Symmetry: C2
Subunit: 367 residues, 2 copies
């Protein structure tokens, strides 16, 4: 045939959660535009429920002690280990044996746990502990996350994460969302599908993740000229971080949302980041005038996150926290779909042969 | 952008081309890299070599020796414990993403985790207060299957080692199920092998994945006490409860793995064999009678329970034996996907509500703006 492996272009599901309108240049969560959500200052906790429940009203459960005091230096792996313990310790049941109401609670309870792991891991070990009453009296999950980590966080930094987390909560059917849907289609508990989605996310070729643009942003601040360093990186064989082929029809809606939030909150590195964007776009469009080149949302995601005191290696964990909303939305939708996800494969390998015909059969020990 | 006779679940949609194995359902035969499983079992090819046959495409290599656990965490769920250990493989054992390693390193890292999961299952079935089996009497073993039964039972019956070899080889790989599909999707992103192996175990644990050995032990216990074999199954169907180990046809006529395991039970002289076949004759003849139109055949998971019980495996340790065997299918599909080197990313179609304002949503009354 002329088929493409990996089901490229093959329609697998039917969704009511969100529509990434690439032709129209807008992202809508259950019909509500994300530009409207960040502008009216809707916190990530509410957007989590809008994607999962299809409407507002419900929030997220409080923080609770860790199910396993794990700490290995890899926060992605720590959350997966804790997610495993949810069935024996917290009693998580398979999706087939619980109603939609129980599945929604365990998804929110697991979402809160993943954020508690990330916030605690960022606060230093020898730092004074944040009292539990200060944590439990926070208005939003975003505030609770920042207070558990920073103790007394800047309000402008809380708004930055709220802007980033709702602009990355859900973006269609990628590898991580597909993995959670396949595992949930088996009837396993929600922690197993969440642990599988996190494993798919750890792959470098999965997709979105804040770009490693800080060593370049620092270089522009020191040298002063952005055009020269942008020209240098492309001439010395290295690729340019945060800029490539287009994703939407034109500018990514999430790209302007995170740049407008950076200017609105007063990010110190905003002017350099804009100077970098202009030099990169002018240079990439000058060398390949046939390619459609737009700024990646991962470029301004790194700018916004770094403005909120987020280190580079913690940024991928920041994306995982926001994507819990999209993962839990598609897991519950798959549960209500009630259809196993099994494709097929065609065999092109060797035909029937005897065991003695196989290469290396003389080294096998039998009986 | 529109549905077109669309069915959810990718049923029948071809996703990959594989050289690993072929479940010839229309022919009633299963082949690993072209070799029939009946040959592999009848000529007593150990599981370690079938593992190397599926992953490498030829014979020659083996599996690395056992080692201590990466994590002294044991919650009582061996499935969960193995997943937690698979996690620790990145920081403790240094497992790199598939995108940054060659086929040789990835092949080992798959084999090292495969032996890791076997030892997790192995000495989880041995009492800690029983005498620690000597470390050298394990080294004096030959096959991977033999070292498994040595770590668990201490003095394993040679007949039982053949039974495990018969079972694991039969269930080593069976095409494109959910657990194998999940392992390929995660591997298609470029992550490490331990993440892809952990994703398959999660999908394996779901009830609708199938393949887990059947809970036919109470039925076989009841038949032996009151010997009739037919009135025992006749009553169960009359009362309206499920007949375990029997149902739809997997292969078109007879599952070759069921034929292999039933013959392996008789060849090794399993005490439950005579009682087991009478239950098979009675259940099949009964199910075909109550439904003279539906194709009904013995499930391989019915004989898998007979064989595994003969090997002194408890009822709820049998699922871990399935996960142990399928490591060959998971690793071979992981390595093949690595060489394929293409991301799996399907698409979906939105049919939800059209564009609206945040105020026209049910519940905007209970929103607090930042």
């Amino acid at each position: 045939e002329n088929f493409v492996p990996g089901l490229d272009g093959v329609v697998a599901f039917t969704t009511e959660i969100a529509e990434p309108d690439k032709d129209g240049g807008a992202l809508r969560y259950r019909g509500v535009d994300i530009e409207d959500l960040v502008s009216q200052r809707v916190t990530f906790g509410d957007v989590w429920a809008l994607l999962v429940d299809g409407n507002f009203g419900s929030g997220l459960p409080p923080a609770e002690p860790f199910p396993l005091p794990i700490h290995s230096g890899d926060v992605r792996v720590d959350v997966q280990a804790g997610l495993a313990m949810l069935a024996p310790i917290w009693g998580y049941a398979p999706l087939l044996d619980i109603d939609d109401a129980t599945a929604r609670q365990q998804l929110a309870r697991a979402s809160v746990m993943a954020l508690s792991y990330v916030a605690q891991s960022a606060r230093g070990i020898y730092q004074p502990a944040v009292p539990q009453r200060i944590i439990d009296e926070c208005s939003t999950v975003t505030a609770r996350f920042m207070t558990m980590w920073q103790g007394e966080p800047d309000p402008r930094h809380i708004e930055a994460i709220d802007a980033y987390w709702v602009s990355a909560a859900e973006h269609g059917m990628n590898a991580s969302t597909f993995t959670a849907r396949v595992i949930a289609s088996t009837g396993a508990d929600v922690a197993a599908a969440l642990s599988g989605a996190i494993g798919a996310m750890s792959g470098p070729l999965h997709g979105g993740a804040p770009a490693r643009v800080l060593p370049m942003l620092d270089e522009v601040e020191r040298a002063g000229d952005a055009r020269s360093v942008v020209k240098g990186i492309l001439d010395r064989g290295e690729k340019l971080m945060g800029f490539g082929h287009r994703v939407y029809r034109a500018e990514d809606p999430r790209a302007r949302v995170l740049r407008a939030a950076a200017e609105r909150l007063g990010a110190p590195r905003y002017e350099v980041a804009v100077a970098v964007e202009q030099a990169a776009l002018s240079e990439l469009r000058e060398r390949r005038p046939d390619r459609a080149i737009e700024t990646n949302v991962e470029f301004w995601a790194a700018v916004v996150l770094d403005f909120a005191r987020v280190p580079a290696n913690m940024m991928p964990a920041m994306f995982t926290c926001g994507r819990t909303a999209g993962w839990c939305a598609h897991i519950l939708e798959q549960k209500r779909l009630g259809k196993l996800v099994r494709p097929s494969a065609i065999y092109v390998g060797p035909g029937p042969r005897s065991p003695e015909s196989v290469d290396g059969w003389e080294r096998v020990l039998t009986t």
